[PDB]
């Protein structure tokens, strides 16, 4: 039972580094140690070690790596590196040497300069700026053409979607999709679907119209993506417009949505804004009592994840988890 | 049913008229019979009398009156009131005639001149051509607004809400609705609300932002519906803009919206456009197994209601009854 259990028992497998460099942060540390007790990933903490020293006590962060960015041996390595990539902003050399002190900075590098597998922080820092270094130093995949913030969503007693679980987007980062964007996130939604779940991806692009019933600027910005997706990724199971009773329920798609590749199946829910996206998985989560779990980004080089500011040691852990498993993606 | 329940109860003791013009589908005669029987609402059957009862069968529906759209007392009065209503579109008398033989176009007239107080129809007749007469002769209520349409959502196990109770505007009907548009629906459910289910209204002006978390131009649509709202109907609790979380649930609310007369308590959902209504309402039903009424018409005149496909005898009968609810507006 649970997506999460599932998730950290592959990630004890795949032996991914992850940095966290909240390490003035006390569950962090208690994370790290949880971490490090189950192998779900060996680990870095960005840090100070004197500082941690107070931090950890009856906690045993030996197995893991601690790094300081005005110490450690490759530092100027990580300041060139930061530099280049930022220079064309009018920032001076020197000016690396601020943000690249940020653990933060230093743990978002580590990770594109192959020293680490992905990122984690935000438990108490700032939830729209890890986004930005991890931007800065990191950017978009392959075929990513932008990035995406999804969901996994896990209905009690539900046999819709895949035994329960979906996976919404973009329902966390991206506020007004294009036509393109709508299309470029069905595609990255469906391959991160896939590797976190396990299942086929059928991907069902969300209307209140079902392939006819309606017609809008709406309903053809939707069309249009599910069109231009059933096309860049041909393989992939996508169907449009849909409803979310003939996207999931078959007895509807056998009447609204006949031979379709997803009506009635359907185990993604792609949204046309973030209005629609974001009060979709509220109302999962607080009326139809589905454990959420997100924002989770996609789209990146590396996974670099970003948490709440208000959640545990058990949560990061997972959130490690995760991004272990999405690290497996370029292997 | 419970939310059906106690508004079949409360039609009983309104006493009010309602036009079932439909009346070659056995199903509508069916209601309407369990309707009179039950003492539910008082019926005009609009058609040919001969044609009613023979369909009827051994169906007690003696105490509806008929009206024959071909052949009743005020027939050139309705037809010369929709060339009036409609001339300035290109409708010429000659057309008039023959637009008014229609029976749902006949019934939506009797309730306009106040020979009913709503109409119902729809249930093996396309929407557009329910709504439509509706629009055209019996209009919105003032000169105000738009016609929308609502859900009833019914939680079950659910104490958010009004004990799991909610409505849903525009989950149904308005596709792409101006700020105007949003900000009027928000009033008009308020009090929709307020009149079905009989709870203080409580209405959140929906976004994925709440209270200024983020700014694009959707969530400045919500700022300037809300705002707009509040300036209509200043006695209202009414706020924006609200992610679902911060509208129901009252821990969040508190660190989201602290001090909100809406957030927390929530019992109204308005939605930026039918894309979020629609998806939010099939969700509600779907995955979390509420009970969903609707779609439902609000802000006319009088109310007019359309059905649909695949309703029962029972589901019209609990329409009807609907009917008669959102026709006490008026009495007080
Ligand atoms: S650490 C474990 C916390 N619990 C969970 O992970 C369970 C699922 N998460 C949630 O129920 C919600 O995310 C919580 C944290 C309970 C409440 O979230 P909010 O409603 O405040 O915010 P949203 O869920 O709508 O997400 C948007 C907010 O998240 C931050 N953010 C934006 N984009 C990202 C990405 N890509 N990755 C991580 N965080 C991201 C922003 O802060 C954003 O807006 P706020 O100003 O914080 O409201
Ligand atoms: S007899 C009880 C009817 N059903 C219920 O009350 C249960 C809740 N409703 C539903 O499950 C759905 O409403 C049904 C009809 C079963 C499924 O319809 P869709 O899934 O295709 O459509 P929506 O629910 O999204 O509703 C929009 C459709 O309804 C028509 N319509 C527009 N505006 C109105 C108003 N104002 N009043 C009544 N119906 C209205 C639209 O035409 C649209 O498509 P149609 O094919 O014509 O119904």
Redesign the interface.
Known sequence: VTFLEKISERAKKLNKTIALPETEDIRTLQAAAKILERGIADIVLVGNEADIKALAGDLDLSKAKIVDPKTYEKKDEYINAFYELRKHKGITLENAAEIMSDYVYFAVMMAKLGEVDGVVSGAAHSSSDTLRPAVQIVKTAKGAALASAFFIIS?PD?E?GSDGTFLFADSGMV??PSVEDVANIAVISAKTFELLVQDVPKVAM???STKGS?K???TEATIASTKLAQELAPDIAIDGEL???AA??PKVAASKAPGSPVAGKANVFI??????????Y?????????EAYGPITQGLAKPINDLSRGCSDEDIVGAVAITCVQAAAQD
């Open positions: 209905v539900c819709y506020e007004m969300l209307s209140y309606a809008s600027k709406l409803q979310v009773d999931i329920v949204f046309p804004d973030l209005n629609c996206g974001n009060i979709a509220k109302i999962a989560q607080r009326l139809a009592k589905a």
